[PDB]
Write a protein that binds this ligand. Structure first.
Ligand SMILES: C/C(=C\C(=O)OCCCCCCCCC(=O)O)C[C@@H]1OC[C@H](C[C@@H]2O[C@H]2[C@@H](C)[C@H](C)O)[C@H](O)[C@@H]1O
Ligand SMILES: [K+]
Ligand SMILES: [Mg+2]
Ligand SMILES: [Mg+2]
Ligand SMILES: [Mg+2]
Ligand SMILES: [Mg+2]
Ligand SMILES: [Mg+2]
Ligand SMILES: [Mg+2]
Ligand SMILES: [Mg+2]
Ligand SMILES: [Mg+2]
Ligand SMILES: [Mg+2]
Ligand SMILES: [Mg+2]
Ligand SMILES: [Zn+2]
Ligand SMILES: [Zn+2]
Length: 917
RNA sequence: GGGCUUGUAGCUCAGGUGGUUAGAGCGCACCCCUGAUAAGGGUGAGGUCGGUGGUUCAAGUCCACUCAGGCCCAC
């Protein structure tokens, strides 16, 4: 007859293959339907709280692997805290203002000039919300649990109003002020431009050398040797302002003939070389320290009146002559280092290349031809020049293809310098996972210049400022807070819909404008300000949250980004960091650790990992990366992830099928009555559990990925589950020995699925769904197993038994290569003490060595002759087992018997079978 | 160029105060099993630690320089 019918084979419909791309949507569908997000919250209703504040991704485009890495790590954290009983609301957010979106619309074919600000802004909003829906869909497909149905958005009235109140408070503490800054300006478009509207094209520029003297006397500290000058911009000459000097680097030359001017060290060679001067390459003499040449007061001719100073510099040396000269009226950093000191803003020029003030003969022409021929009047006619024509790449208006120039424009600033030390101190009191995180942002805030907070665009939050003709600036608590009031109720659009007096309080009045009339600012705030105020607009505003967030977690680029604008803004108005803990991760690279491009074809997108392999696979990958640095993804990397996932899943499947008939409520064996081998695994489970919780407490998911594998592969699959077959399949269903293993098997099943739940969200649920008798619905609404003390002596004892098992297996291998044995069951193992190990005594405290080694018989003797091979754990002798093969359990027995139609059954199996019938 | 950061076996990772033949899991090779079967067991082969030079009796582990990466600036 057939023996398999009497066997107890595993039973479960839990599939070996995941089918993730088709199973996960259903599971997600159910989680939403049963509003688990809010259920998870009410489950921990009055417990300690954990607030992880989400940084708002930009509402434009497709999520990339970075969004996935970042969101999945966040979910790990909140899920684990939730599973430890913490009330941990996770509310995603979206960054919705900014130039990029205005551009998307324009590129889409919207066209501002043809509808008005109000209609264009609504178009931006409509677009942002559409993008959000798409992104929200993708985020949820990763298995992330969060308030996705009621996320915070920077375009929401309440958020905008909060942002305004932040602007108001900073303005009150005197941290907001109006000034000016140079910006790309297109005389063609009669408007300023951002780098995104700039494209380079070669241009004909007449470069000249205007060597200017060093009169006065304050600068005659070292002779009266003139200071040369070279500008590729003749119109950038009527801007008499300082010169240059890169501290440390010195040299002055002072050479024969001419006037013994000044060049430089690494410059000299490539300086006079083109100066046409080479009257016997005359040698230098009295070089006078560059760096130290500060305040070397020098009158710069051409029709000057003021002498130009010189201060520290940042980047000057190169093919470009050592003589730079400045004029904050038309220069990027030419304005920074050139302003700290009493410096008057130079040059005019209206929205058109035309100027007026200070302009001599050229009082109404342009910045071009009015130079190359006009201003070229004032040149070598006293400053020794060399009018040359050169070609180089130059900034151009991308639509008009015409040249762009720098021009100082009124801008608004946030006074970082006044709150600097305050931010530094808040950082010092901020916790970090790694010390360099603290150092990076520290030096950041330390070397940070003033914050330009204004932009001349329409898609954003308006600076709540009003102007009173007579002078200007109306920015008081009353005015800002009333604007906040309106914004809170109508949103920012109100600003573009109403007149100034409608945006002002109760029939407001001010000394300015005796006629009760007012003007309003038009600039909007920099988007960094928008997100940077998220701690106010969401943490302080929403009921479920609390201002100081337990932590912020984002990419490395946020040290200059959201981490920075958020702390700057929070310290300014609250005096504290908006985050008690700052955790950052790296970027996602390809397999070689190189940037994903597209021209290179090494991208890999989240949407594809999910569709092709599954969200649970994208997640396991995350847990396996050392996120504190850059991480790497590729097809070979993911094939690995797939292979580990299959092993975890398959192992869980086997355990599931073998506890299908186990009812914990009535079949469990007391710990004190478990077979010792079962108590050993129960303790390996406790050890693995303790270790994993610790890892979760430290955000060390990589350690869990590593340990889970070793526990699943080595302890379970390789050993316990294998050895268990001779028990689970053969013993009587309700026998003490079978129920003892099931008792531990069940606990491991349950606990391990719970311990993995934060990571393998879908599979954990699917396994939970196939486990009999689990209390709660959903693993995700259950608590982590409690950490208990392990029996260390039991562990050491079995650790040694395991190392002894390896020697046996080695002995079994040798014998198997010799065809002496096939499966380990056809073997008889004899072992005895060695000089290296007292095997005989040690093996005395173990039961059923034959089952433990998966062999038919084990004989412990005491001593073996010089036939037995020696092992680290004793001498071992392997030979084919005695007796005949029992057709049921496949162990060899010398006492096979028949039970009715079933022959060749060992005594053990005869008993099990007889109890069937 | 500046701040911070990474480089150990095919892959992902371990390797306190420097000290015998650098560890793990997977993968791979070969063998066994065929009662987890688009499964399972076993053995074994692979790194000299990005490079060079030093400190030291002795360095993956300390120093210097260097190569190739990464984020953010300077640009
Ligand atoms: C780890 C990251 C990127 C990455 O790893 O890079 C992924 C690789 C890019 C894909 C290449 C595509 C081809 C393009 C080509 O051709 O070159 C960065 C992270 O992102 C997610 C979050 C985004 C929000 O903005 C952040 C904040 C806090 C603020 C409010 O804005 C997170 O905070 C962080 O910023
Ligand atoms: K088999
Ligand atoms: Mg680790
Ligand atoms: Mg294995
Ligand atoms: Mg390597
Ligand atoms: Mg490697
Ligand atoms: Mg590492
Ligand atoms: Mg191996
Ligand atoms: Mg080498
Ligand atoms: Mg050496
Ligand atoms: Mg020596
Ligand atoms: Mg060491
Ligand atoms: Zn061109
Ligand atoms: Zn039997």
């Amino acid at each position: 007859m057939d023996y398999e019918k009497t066997l107890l084979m595993p039973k479960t419909d839990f599939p070996m293959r995941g089918g993730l791309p088709n199973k996960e949507p259903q599971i997600q569908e159910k989680w939403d339907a049963e509003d688990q997000y809010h259920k998870a919250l009410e489950k921990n209703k009055g417990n300690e709280t954990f607030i992880l504040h989400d940084g708002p991704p930009y509402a434009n485009g497709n999520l990339h692997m970075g969004h996935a890495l970042n969101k999945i790590l966040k979910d790990f954290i909140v899920r684990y805290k939730t599973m430890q009983g913490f009330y941990a609301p996770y509310v995603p957010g979206w960054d919705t203002h900014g130039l990029p979106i205005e551009q998307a619309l324009t590129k889409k074919g919207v066209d501002r000039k043809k509808m008005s600000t109000a209609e264009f802004r609504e178009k931006c909003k409509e677009f942002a919300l559409e993008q959000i829906e798409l992104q929200k869909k993708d985020f949820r497909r990763l298995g992330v649990r969060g308030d996705f149905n009621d996320p915070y958005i920077t375009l929401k009235p309440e958020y905008e109003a909060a942002q305004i109140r932040i602007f108001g408070e900073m303005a009150d503490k005197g941290l907001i002020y109006k000034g000016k800054k140079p910006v790309y300006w297109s005389p063609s478009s009669e408007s300023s431009l951002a780098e995104a509207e700039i494209e380079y094209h070669d241009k004909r520029s007449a470069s000249i050398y205007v060597a200017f003297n060093v009169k006065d006397d304050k600068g005659v500290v070292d002779a009266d040797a003139k200071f040369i000058i070279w500008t590729t911009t003749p119109w950038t000459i009527p801007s008499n302002v300082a010169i240059t000097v890169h501290p440390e680097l010195k040299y002055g030359q002072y050479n024969v003939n001419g006037e013994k001017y000044i060049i430089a060290e690494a410059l000299s060679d490539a300086v006079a070389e083109a100066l046409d001067w080479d009257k016997a390459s005359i040698k230098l003499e009295k070089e006078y320290t560059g760096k130290e040449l500060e305040w070397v007061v020098a009158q710069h001719p051409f029709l000057d009146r003021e002498s130009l100073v010189i201060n520290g510099d940042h980047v000057t040396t190169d093919a470009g002559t050592g003589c730079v000269h400045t004029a904050p009226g038309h220069g990027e950093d030419d304005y920074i280092v050139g302003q700290q000191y009493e410096l008057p803003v130079i040059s005019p020029i209206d929205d058109k290349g035309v100027f007026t003030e200070e302009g001599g003969q050229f009082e109404g022409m342009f910045y071009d031809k009015a130079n190359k021929a006009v201003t070229d009047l004032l040149t070598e006619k006293g400053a020794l020049l060399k009018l040359d024509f050169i070609t180089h790449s130059y900034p151009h208006d991308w639509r008009t293809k015409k040249p762009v120039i720098f021009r100082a424009t009124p801008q608004w600033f946030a006074s970082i310098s006044k709150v600097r030390q305050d931010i530094l101190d808040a950082i010092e009191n901020t916790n970090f996972k790694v010390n360099w995180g603290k150092t990076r942002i520290y030096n950041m805030v330390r070397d940070r210049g003033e914050w330009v907070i204004s932009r001349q665009r329409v898609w954003g939050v308006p600076l709540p400022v009003f102007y009173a003709e007579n002078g200007e600036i109306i920015m008081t608590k009353e005015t800002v807070n009333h604007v906040a009031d309106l914004f809170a109720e109508h949103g920012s659009n109100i600003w573009f819909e109403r007149e100034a007096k409608d945006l002002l309080p109760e029939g407001f009045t001010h000394p300015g404008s005796p006629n009760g009339t007012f003007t309003k600012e038009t600039d909007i705030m920099d988007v960094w300000f928008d997100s940077g105020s998220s701690h106010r607009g969401v943490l302080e505003t929403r009921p479920e949250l609390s201002f100081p967030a337990d932590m912020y977690l984002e990419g490395s680029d946020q040290y200059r980004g959201w981490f920075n604008s958020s702390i700057t803004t929070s310290v300014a108005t609250r005096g504290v960091s908006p985050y008690k803990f700052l955790l950052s991760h790296g970027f996602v690279m390809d397999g070689e650790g190189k940037k994903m491009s597209k021209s290179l074809g090494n991208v890999i997108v989240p949407d594809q990992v999910v569709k092709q392999k599954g969200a649970d696979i994208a997640r396991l990958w995350v847990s396996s990366t050392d996120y504190l640095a850059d991480v790497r993804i590729s097809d070979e990397i993911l094939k690995q992830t797939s292979d580990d996932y299959r092993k975890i899943r398959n192992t869980l499947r086997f355990m599931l099928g073998n506890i299908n008939d186990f009812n914990p409520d009535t079949d469990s064996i007391p710990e004190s009555e478990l077979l010792e081998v079962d108590r050993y695994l129960l303790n390996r489970l406790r050890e693995f559990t303790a270790s994993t919780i610790n890892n979760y407490e430290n955000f060390d998911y990589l350690n869990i990925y590593q340990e889970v594998q070793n526990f699943i592969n080595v302890e379970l699959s390789n050993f316990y589950l294998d050895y268990g077959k001779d028990i689970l399949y053969i013993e009587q269903r309700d026998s003490h020995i079978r129920r003892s293993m099931q008792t531990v098997l069940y606990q491991i099943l349950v606990d391990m699925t719970k311990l993995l739940a934060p990571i393998l969200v879908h599979t954990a649920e699917e396994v939970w769904s196939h486990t009999p008798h689990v209390k709660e619905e959903s693993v995700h609404l259950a608590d982590m197993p409690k950490v208990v003390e392990v029996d260390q002596a039991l562990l050491d004892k079995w650790r040694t038994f395991m190392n002894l098992r390896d020697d046996v297996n080695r002995a079994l291998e040798t014998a198997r290569n010799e065809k002496v044995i096939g499966k380990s069951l056809e073997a008889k193992v004899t072992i005895a003490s060695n000089d290296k190990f007292n095997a005989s005594e040690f093996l005395t405290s173990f039961d059923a060595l034959h089952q433990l080694f998966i062999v038919s018989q084990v004989k412990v003797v005491d001593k073996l002759d010089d036939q037995a091979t020696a092992y680290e754990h004793g001498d071992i002798v392997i030979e084919h087992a005695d007796g005949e093969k029992c057709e049921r359990c496949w162990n060899y027995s010398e006492d096979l018997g028949a039970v009715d139609e079933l022959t060749h059954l060992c005594p053990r199996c005869q008993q099990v079978v007889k109890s069937l019938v």
